[PDB]
Amino acid sequence: SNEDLPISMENPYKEPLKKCILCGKHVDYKNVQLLSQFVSPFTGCIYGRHITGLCGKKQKEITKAIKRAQIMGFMPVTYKDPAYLKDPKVCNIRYRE
Amino acid sequence: ATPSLRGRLARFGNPRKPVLKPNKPLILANRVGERRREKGEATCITEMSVMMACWKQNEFRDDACRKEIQGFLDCAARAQEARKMRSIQETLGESGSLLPNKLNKLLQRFPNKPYLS
Amino acid sequence: DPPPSTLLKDYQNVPGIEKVDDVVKRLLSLEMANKKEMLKIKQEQFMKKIVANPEDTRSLEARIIALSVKIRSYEEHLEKHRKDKAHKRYLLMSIDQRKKMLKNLRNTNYDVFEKICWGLGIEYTFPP
Amino acid sequence: REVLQLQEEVKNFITRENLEARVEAALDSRKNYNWAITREGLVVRPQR
Amino acid sequence: PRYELALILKAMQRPETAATLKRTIEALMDRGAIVRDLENLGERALPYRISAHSQQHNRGGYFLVDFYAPTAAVESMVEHLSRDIDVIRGNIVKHPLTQELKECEGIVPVPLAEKLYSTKKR
Amino acid sequence: YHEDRIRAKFYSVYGSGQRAFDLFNPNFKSTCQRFVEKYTELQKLGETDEEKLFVETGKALLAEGVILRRVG
Amino acid sequence: TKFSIYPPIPGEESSLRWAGKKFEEIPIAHIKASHNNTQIQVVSASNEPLAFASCGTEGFRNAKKGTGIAAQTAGIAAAARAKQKGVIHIRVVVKGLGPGRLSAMHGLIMGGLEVISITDNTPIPHXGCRPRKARKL
Amino acid sequence: RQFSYLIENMARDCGEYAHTRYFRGGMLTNARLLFGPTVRLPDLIIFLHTLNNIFEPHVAVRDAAKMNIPTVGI
Amino acid sequence: AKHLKFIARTVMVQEGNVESAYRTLNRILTMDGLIEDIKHRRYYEKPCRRRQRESYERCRRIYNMEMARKINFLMRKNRADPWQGC
Amino acid sequence: KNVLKIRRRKMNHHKYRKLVKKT
RNA sequence: AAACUCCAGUUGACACAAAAUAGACUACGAAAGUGGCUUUAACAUAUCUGAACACACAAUAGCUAAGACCCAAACUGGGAUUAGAUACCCCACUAUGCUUAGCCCUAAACCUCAACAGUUAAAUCAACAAAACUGCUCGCCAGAACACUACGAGCCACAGCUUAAAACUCAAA
Ligand code: FES
Ligand SMILES: [K+]
Ligand SMILES: [K+]
Ligand SMILES: [K+]
Ligand SMILES: [K+]
Ligand SMILES: [Mg+2]
Ligand SMILES: [Mg+2]
Ligand SMILES: [Mg+2]
Ligand SMILES: [Mg+2]
Ligand SMILES: [Mg+2]
Ligand SMILES: [Mg+2]
Ligand SMILES: [Mg+2]
Ligand SMILES: [Mg+2]
Ligand SMILES: [Mg+2]
Ligand SMILES: [Mg+2]
Ligand SMILES: [Mg+2]
Ligand SMILES: [Mg+2]
Ligand SMILES: [Mg+2]
Ligand SMILES: [Mg+2]
Ligand SMILES: [Mg+2]
Ligand SMILES: [Mg+2]
Ligand SMILES: [Mg+2]
User: Does CATH place domain E2-94 in 3.40.630.30?
Assistant: First the structure.
């Protein structure tokens, strides 16, 4: 018919889906350094996903890993272990003005 | 990011039990709330309690408490003017992000349309 | 029940499984697996013993055999968990669904219905 | 392939013969499961 | 199945620590377990004070035992660890490396929910 | 359009050209469109591989003096 | 060096000192800010009591105890008895959200003590005892 | 409003009429009261924009149909 | 009770500025939710009442975040009228 | 909706329970 | 005010109770329900509907028996308030909430919206609410009140539950 008509196909400019910083990585309860990056330094409270930026699957894995590590004797509950205070800050929260 | 609303309300087609039970429809109004005055509190009490402390120790003789008395009067004078300064800035919107009157005229131009035209 | 030394259904037909170390045989046996793996071996035995085509899993015979293995697992579960109301419901519902399968098999293929009852030890009962 | 991989691993399993030798070897070594993540998704292994 | 024993031992000298590990691995073998590996995570301060067997502990030796065992051995092993006075805290979990992580394509964005209310004029 | 596949890859590999689009000129040709036209010419010469037809196109433009700075 | 709001960790080698004393050696001011009273105890790093004052021991009674100025007065009283015993720098551990939570700290400073840190130890049960039923007002 | 001035001039130049301002209720449906009993209404209404400034249809579209006036509209 | 002390909820004072240290601590406890939690725990909130409060708080967050998103989207249009007089 | 129908049932049941207690 | 004053604060030891944060997640289960950790078992049905004549379940409260007991707490006692206060407010304490073994079988058990299959066009549609409908099936409804009642019957229920009327009365509800 006509060569200039549009053709049916999938979006070629579609951007790849975004991935969480832990996408494709194993979350172990023994890796307390990683888990400590997702708790409050002052209270040890687990951060919600709106602060951690994790997907639902990894927010759950991190949460379950933290709870297991805490009660098995690997991780403190009421504060972030001071050894891990100088690790990369991956959470979106600021406590100082 | 706004929390999800998919499957949260009791509706035909939604198998699960409702997550949310809003008493008002979750639909944006064309107005924002009015600026809620902050509860007032007593000020200058620190200086007031230093003056009254000297009075207690000096038999309520102002001659010995001149320095503290003047300090209490200065705090009230500064705080009295702070009443005028804050009020002026509060009306001007110097500290507010925007005034509810100004923010509502802007929403009047872009009213939420929950209906079809 | 099958012996614990029985190999898993996945590793029973790999070539050379009989010449591996004894330790490797323990790790691929029922002894080192969960109970669900033992039920897959039980299901296989009943299929060869009863059904004409042990590879057809969608026939009414295979479903009755699969459900009969689940029913026995619930009965063993409830023997240890007598206040587990959730699994008591699953048992009673499963028994009712096997009777509904047996009814439909009796109406369509009586010769196969008889072999299913003998093979599985089911005494068919007409409802009151 | 899983039976072959498993057949080699069994050579390094602990037995009553090498139990005393494997314990002392464990006490001399250290295993670290700790590592941190960055905002770019990069692993930061510990300084050891 | 494959399990992982997370073992916190009382801070002791090397000879008593080896005797406790040997005594613990033999307990697993007596119950039918096939022990695969033993890893030392190092002696460290506990995240909190732990009272065990009429004693207070602030430091412990962290060890891992990777092993295969029948499902009935777990319950019996937990009882054995509760009576060993040199064990501060011992937990048996299903080995994390058995669970295979499904692939993830990324974050599928969620559009704002639509048609929650009829379009009638209110 | 078929050429959108070529445009998507070009923007990924080489990014948007530092040259500015002039959408007022109805006959404007960007570096991407110049790339697409050369890519189409070489395809009509019988070449059918995609990864090979893309590398030869970059060379042709460099020979013609075009600046192609790979993004990464 | 830049200022760190995180306290020095015991056993590590810090350079911070207060009158030649390390953080682990500074006495502790325990402030219990209740809804109807405020109790302040200053103790040494070894848990030796040095001074105790509450709104009740300062002559306040009933609803006047549950006020800021009442806690401020209790702080000054504890600071005075503590300063006599050789205390200058104190670590503050405050538990409770009563009205004398902050006012009790001001009294410690007005009494001559220097606060080097503030710690909240308000008890939060992680699931614990059922509190009393709500009030109908 | 970006084109109010342009449209008003085009109408004057062709010898026709323009209404680019706020449309008061009843200009068409109540014209006899607003203008007089002998007022002649338009025989054709041309909309260069059919939406008002709150992105709804211009009221004159509905009222033009009420008064049986044909409408041309972009 | 079993944890180390002077780590949790501890803020150091700078240059004798105790007010800024207390405000920082209060800001920490608020953002982590401890202040509202302590207050809600003074009297027992029955589960039916807790579920109603959480529902109300979640619907308010959605509304408040959606109204805020619309304000930021429309704020650019608060510029002076470009077509004044027309 | 109002609870006026519930209120009638409430009174009936209250007076009934009280009658049963009295007799 | 009463109450306690072998009281209070710090520190240490220390549950048969309850389960911050995560959760801005929206999952599991037939429903009831289920959000500390671990492990074991384990989540019916390869058409659909279907038992009020059955079977198995079913929050909280409650009953029987033997235990535990921090805290909360009907009742009860004391303090206060009030014209009175058998309440609202404060304190103390019990049944009870917990476990085990049996009962009881009720909720605004309501997301008051039945299951399965399908549609978004025509007339879109009383109102409001959570847009309007189609096929098919079971269950249920027919003015108000009497009445979650009477009687009968069944039930481990004996001041109970389930099923459930009529007479008189009204012109409304
Ligand atoms: S986005 Fe892939 S696991 Fe989080
Ligand atoms: K908890
Ligand atoms: K929550
Ligand atoms: K009911
Ligand atoms: K309801
Ligand atoms: Mg409502
Ligand atoms: Mg109402
Ligand atoms: Mg009545
Ligand atoms: Mg059915
Ligand atoms: Mg019940
Ligand atoms: Mg009971
Ligand atoms: Mg009590
Ligand atoms: Mg009791
Ligand atoms: Mg309990
Ligand atoms: Mg309910
Ligand atoms: Mg109903
Ligand atoms: Mg039905
Ligand atoms: Mg349907
Ligand atoms: Mg009737
Ligand atoms: Mg009833
Ligand atoms: Mg009755
Ligand atoms: Mg009767």
Answer: no
